[PDB]
Structures are given as C-alpha cells and as structure tokens.
C-alpha cells in the first residue's frame, strides 16, 4: 500500500484544453519540507488534504 | 392468512373448454387464459359462484367449476347484467351471449364476413388488411410482414 499524504498550499491555476484541472503546490505535513506540483481532477481549495500514489514525479499541462 | 399444507390435490395441466391452464398460478387470472374471459368478467363469476379468491388454481372440484361453465355460457340467468357481455343484442338473433373459447373468433368471423360479403366499408377494408377504425395510415404501422 504505497501511499502518502498531501495538503494543498496554493492553487497554481488551470490547464487542460477543456479547463477541468487545477495545478496545485502541495506538501506532506509533519516535518513539512515537501513541495511538488500535481494536477488534480475534482474541485480543490486551500488546506484540502489529498491522496498520492507515488510520493514524487508529478506532471504539468 | 397463515400456513396450511394440504395433500397432493393440486395440479398443473388442467383442460377446461379446449384450453389447458397452469395450476401453480393464482386463480382469477389463470382464467383469462381463455379468450372471452377477461379480468372484469373473470373476477365476478367466480365470486357469484361462491369460491374463496385467496386460493391458487390447484384446489376445487368439477361442479365447483361446472358452477362456472354453466354460469359463463348461461349468465343472463345469473344476476350478472347485460353490460358485462362481449356480445349483447346480437345481430343474428337479438339475444345476448358471451363468446368464449373458440366462439370469439367464430362469431368475430361472422361479424367480419357479414360485412365483407355485404361489401360494407369495414368489410372490404378488413379484407385488405387496413385499419377499419379511421386512424391515420401514412405515419404509422409499417414494419409487419
């Protein structure tokens, strides 16, 4: 069960040709120290903790 | 109600007026298995022949339902009115029947033949396969044969 936590620090914006995805900066909490930009599907705002299936190697566009 | 068991006196397969009827089926509808026996007219005779409707078809005796065959082919003499009858006032003899089993198609045939040979509209219109009831015929009713 390779999972990890991540709450969204800020919302970089949207991408996707139809406009239904958001770029987010993120971190895992205790000894926070992470920052990586994942793209996310349903609506998301600040401090929304969310899942992750590999702790790094995010994307863009 | 509550549970009984009963002995082996139930049946599937039971032929009554040339038509076998399923027995595992509850009663008043296993009667509609006969042409001419609808639901209004099946619901009534079997109460004005004094039977309990909660029972499936598997019970009963011949004169418990000869109670119904002489009811159904001679109902004018059994307190059921004339507006329940698929043939009332006739046109051959003026007396009111109830066409049943085979009798429906046959005295339907007479109804069509009486018009088809008189060259009435409905007569040769029936003889063509077209709608006798005045409905539109361009937009509707196509795939068929």
């Amino acid at each position: 069960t390779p999972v990890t936590l991540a709450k969204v620090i800020k919302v970089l914006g949207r991408t996707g040709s139809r406009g239904g995805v958001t770029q987010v900066r993120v971190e895992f909490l205790e000894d926070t120290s992470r920052t990586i930009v994942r793209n996310v599907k349903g609506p998301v705002r600040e401090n929304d903790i969310l899942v992750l299936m590999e702790s790094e190697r995010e994307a863009r566009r | 109600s509550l549970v009984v068991q009963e002995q082996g006196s139930f049946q599937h397969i039971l032929r009554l007026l040339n038509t076998n009827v399923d027995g595992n089926i509850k009663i008043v509808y296993a009667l509609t298995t006969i042409k001419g026996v609808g639901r209004r007219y099946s619901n009534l005779v079997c109460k004005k022949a004094d039977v309990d409707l909660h029972k499936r078809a598997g019970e009963l005796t011949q004169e418990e339902l000869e109670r119904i065959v002489q009811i159904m082919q001679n109902p004018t003499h059994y307190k059921i009115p004339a507006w329940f009858l698929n043939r009332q006032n006739d046109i051959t003899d003026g007396k009111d029947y109830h066409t049943l089993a085979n009798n429906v198609e046959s005295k339907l045939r007479d109804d069509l033949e009486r018009l088809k040979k008189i060259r009435a509209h409905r007569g040769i219109r029936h003889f063509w396969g077209l709608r006798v009831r005045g409905q539109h015929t361009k937009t509707t009713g196509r795939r068929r044969a």
């Binding site: - | 509550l2 549970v3 068991q5 009963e6």
Partner: protein, 70 residues
C-alpha cells in the same frame, strides 16, 4: 431455478432451520436460499410474526425486517 408457490416440507423445515448465522430475514431471504417463491413468503413472515423467532423492527408495508431470537 424455476421456484415454488406452496408449503410442503423438503427444505421447508429448513424453513425452521431458519436463524443462526444469517440474522436478518424477510421475503428476499426466503426466496433466495435455494428455496421458495415469494408470495407465500408474505403470509409466512406474517405467520412467524404471529409467534416465531422473528421479531419486527420495521413498521412499514413495503419491506418487513425481522431478526433472530435476539
């Protein structure tokens, strides 16, 4: 299966083998368990409601819910 509409007893005192390790019982449980069809399963849920192990939790027409000898 083709299912059944009367109350002999082949697996129908499995109609009395009718509680342990399957608590909830109602019409749907009766028909499924390699068993009856479900219109005599309504007087029967009325029959063991009369005096049986099944006790009513549910007060409504559309579904009855009955449990074990809890």
């Amino acid at each position: 299966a083709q299912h059944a509409v009367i109350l002999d007893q082949e697996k129908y005192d499995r109609i009395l083998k009718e509680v342990p390790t399957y608590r909830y019982v109602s019409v749907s449980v009766l028909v499924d368990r390699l068993k009856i069809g479900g219109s005599l399963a309504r007087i029967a849920l009325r029959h063991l409601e009369k005096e049986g192990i099944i006790k009513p939790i549910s007060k409504h027409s559309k579904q009855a819910i009955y449990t074990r000898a809890t």
